Design a protein around this nucleic acid. Structure first.
Ligand SMILES: Nc1ncnc2c1ncn2[C@@H]1O[C@H](COP(=O)(O)OP(=O)(O)O)[C@@H](O)[C@H]1O
Length: 229
DNA sequence: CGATCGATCGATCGATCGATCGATCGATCGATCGATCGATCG
């Protein structure tokens, strides 16, 4: 399930699904989908059978809401109203508010004629004195960004942040598994104490920041996975 | 009218501080090792 819909203190429930023939290889890890399928179980505790889904069909606003948001676009003070709306509990700080607003929208994607892609994400570093509500600014973004992941520098790892390869005990096969920086694909991630994380985690971030990709080379397999984070 | 003695200038040694380099010891992050328990195939 979506981590945004998961209240704190809970790990999102994971469910195994199977697809065959033309429905295979449509979705990679980190892709948000809508599922139509059959709920069932199969043996693989005392009698704890592992649930699984036979996939039948996967897909991946109100008219008045469109007019409501179009009216919001037509507001003469739209930019300043939204600027004030970002963390209204805090005072002043208009410039940092406005940059974070730019973070929410992000840039527009462009593709070179040679096939390369320009990174559209806007990444901002807060580098000031302690006690300036800089931690609170990240927390508010987590509650406004539809796709939001918040993690600390200390309690994170390159395998935890980026992708990893692990064996699924349900089907006894090695699966490619995404991480925190993979879940936040197509959204915004809030990392705190960025200075406190190790260089290897930073190095993996460099590929994500400047190429929107994560390259995995573990055990005896190599792969590259995109991450528009 | 020469005489006593008080007060300052420059040579000049020396001694006290500054600073730079170099040697030495301690604080600290990374590489390495172990373990245990899961499956895979022999
Ligand atoms: N301009 C401000 N308006 C309101 N509260 C503020 C402002 N600046 C700082 N604060 C207070 O500072 C706290 C957040 O500080 P935080 O960013 O967590 O400190 P740190 O930088 O050490 O992480 C909040 O409790 C908030 O009330």
């Amino acid at each position: 399930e979506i981590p945004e819909l998961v209240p704190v203190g809970e790990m999102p429930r994971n469910l195994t699904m199977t697809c065959d023939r033309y429905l295979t290889n449509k979705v990679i890890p980190g892709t948000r989908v809508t599922i139509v399928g059959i709920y069932s179980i199969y043996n693989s505790g005392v009698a704890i059978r592992t649930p699984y889904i036979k996939i039948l069909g996967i897909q991946s606003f109100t008219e008045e809401e469109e007019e409501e948001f179009l009216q919001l676009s037509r507001n003469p003070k739209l930019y300043e109203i939204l600027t004030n709306s970002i963390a209204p509990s805090i005072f002043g700080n208009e410039d940092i508010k406005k940059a974070i607003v730019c973070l929410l929208m992000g840039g527009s994607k462009k593709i070179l004629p040679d096939g390369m892609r320009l990174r559209g994400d806007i990444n901002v570093l807060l580098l000031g004195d302690p006690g300036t509500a800089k931690s609170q600014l990240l927390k508010f973004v987590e509650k406004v960004s539809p796709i939001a992941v918040y993690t600390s520098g200390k309690g994170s790892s390159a395998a935890g942040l980026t992708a990893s390869v692990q064996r699924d005990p349900m089907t006894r096969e090695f699966y490619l598994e995404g991480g925190a920086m993979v879940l936040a694909d197509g959204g915004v991630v809030c990392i705190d104490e960025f200075d406190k994380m190790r260089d290897e985690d930073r190095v993996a971030i460099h590929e994500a920041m400047e190429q929107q990709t994560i390259s995995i080379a573990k055990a005896g397999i190599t792969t590259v996975l995109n991450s528009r984070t």
